C-alpha cells in the first residue's frame, strides 16, 4: 500500500473538495476551521505498471493551508504534516509521499527532531525521483533545442538544496554538462557544494540567469525577485522544479519557455482527484514525481525512505530509481510545442 500526502492549495480550493471529506459545502470554513480539521485519507488508488503489476494507494489529505503559514501559524502548519504522517501509518500504509508544502515543511522545521512513535522508513521525500525527472527534463530539452549539453550552461538556483545538490551531482557526472552556474542564499554551503562537485561557478542570481541555457529553479522563491525576460538568452528553459510552481505566470516572452519540472506522465490512465490535478495538463496520468516515488517503490517492493534529509541523495539512488521510472511507465513531462 504506498500513500500520497498531500494538502491544500487555498481556502477556495479547500471548499470544492470539502464535500467529498464529509462536510458542508455551504458552511463556515475558516482557517480556524481547517486548522482543527483531522487528517483523511480520501480517495482509493489502483495503478498498473507497463510490467503489468498492480500496485494500490491511498491519497491521504493533509489540510495543510499555505495560508497557515501566512498567518504565521507554523505550529499548526507543522501539526496538519505530522498528523498526516501518524494517520498514513496507523492506516498500516506501508511507504508514503511528502508531496508540495508538506516535505519543504518537515524540513525547514527539523520535524525529524503524539501517540506512538513514527518509522520514519515508512515514508519518503520523493526527491531523488524529482530530481531525476528534472535531469531527464534538462537532457530532453537540450536535445529538442539543438543544443549540445556538453558545451551548454546550467543554471540551478536553489543549487543547495536536497533536489538542486542532486540536480548538480547528476548535470556534472551524468550529462557532463559545460558550463555549471551554482546559485543560492548561503555562502558557506555553496563553497562546500563546489568543492564536493570540483567544479561550478558560483554566481549571484543576477549575474547567473544570463549566462543559462537552462535554468532549473528549485528554491524557496523569494520575495522581491524581478525576473526579467529580456535578459535571457533568446532560446531559454526555465524548469520550475520547487513547490510551488509559479514561473509560468511570472515569466513570459518569445524564446523564453517555461516547462513544470520534476512532473511525470504515465503510460494508463489513473482514477483519482488529487492534489494538484487542476494545474496538470493531463490529470488522469500526470503527477508529481515524488507521489510516483512512492509508487515505484511500492512497485519494486523498496519499503524504506529511499529519498530524506537534506544532501542525501546520490548518483547511484537516482540511477536506481530512474529506471524503475522508465520500467513502470513514467515518462518526464516535455516541452509542448505549441511554442509558437
Not at 491521504?60 to 502548519?77: D, H, V, Y
Request: glycine share 8%; net charge negative; proline share 3%.
Amino acid at each position: 500500500m504506498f500513500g500520497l500526502i498531500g494538502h491544500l492549495t487555498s481556502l477556495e480550493q479547500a471548499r470544492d473538495v470539502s464535500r467529498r471529506m464529509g462536510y458542508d459545502e455551504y458552511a463556515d470554513q475558516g482557517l480556524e476551521f481547517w486548522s482543527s480539521a483531522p487528517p483523511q485519507i480520501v480517495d482509493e488508488i489502483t495503478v498498473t505498471s507497463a510490467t503489468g503489476k498492480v500496485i494500490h494507494g491511498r491519497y491521504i489529505e493533509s489540510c495543510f493551508l499555505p495560508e497557515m503559514l501566512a498567518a504565521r501559524r507554523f505550529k499548526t502548519a507543522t501539526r496538519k504534516v505530522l498528523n498526516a504522517m501518524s494517520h498514513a501509518q496507523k492506516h498500516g500504509i506501508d511507504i508514503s509521499a511528502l508531496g508540495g508544502f508538506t516535505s519543504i515543511i518537515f524540513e525547514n522545521f527539523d520535524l525529524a527532531s503524539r501517540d506512538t512513535t513514527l518509522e520514519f522508513e515508512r515514508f519518503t521525500t520523493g526527491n531523488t525521483h524529482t530530481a531525476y525527472v528534472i535531469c531527464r527534463q534538462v537532457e530532453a530539452a537540450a536535445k529538442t533545442l539543438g543544443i549540445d549539453i556538453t558545451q551548454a550552461t546550467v543554471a540551478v538556483v536553489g543549487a543547495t538544496g536536497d533536489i538542486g545538490s542532486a540536480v548538480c551531482r547528476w548535470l556534472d557526472l551524468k550529462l557532463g554538462v559545460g558550463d555549471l552556474i551554482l546559485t543560492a542564499r548561503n555562502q558557506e554551503r555553496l563553497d562546500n557544494l563546489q568543492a564536493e562537485l570540483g567544479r561550478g561557478k558560483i554566481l549571484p542570481l543576477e549575474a547567473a540567469l544570463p549566462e543559462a541555457d537552462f535554468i532549473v529553479w528549485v528554491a524557496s522563491m523569494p520575495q522581491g525577485v524581478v525576473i526579467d525576460p529580456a535578459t535571457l538568452k533568446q532560446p531559454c528553459v526555465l524548469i520550475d522544479g520547487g513547490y510551488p510552481k509559479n514561473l509560468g505566470s511570472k515569466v513570459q516572452g518569445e524564446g523564453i519557455y517555461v516547462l513544470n519540472g520534476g512532473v511525470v506522465e504515465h503510460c494508463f490512465d489513473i482514477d483519482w482527484q488529487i492534489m494538484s490535478a487542476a494545474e496538470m495538463a493531463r490529470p488522469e496520468r500526470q503527477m508529481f514525481a515524488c507521489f510516483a516515488e512512492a509508487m515505484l517503490l511500492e512497485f519494486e517492493g523498496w519499503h524504506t525512505n529511499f529519498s530524506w534529509g537534506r544532501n542525501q541523495i546520490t548518483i547511484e539512488k537516482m540511477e536506481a530509481i530512474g529506471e524503475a521510472s522508465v520500467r513502470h511507465g513514467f515518462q518526464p513531462l516535455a516541452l509542448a510545442i505549441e511554442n509558437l
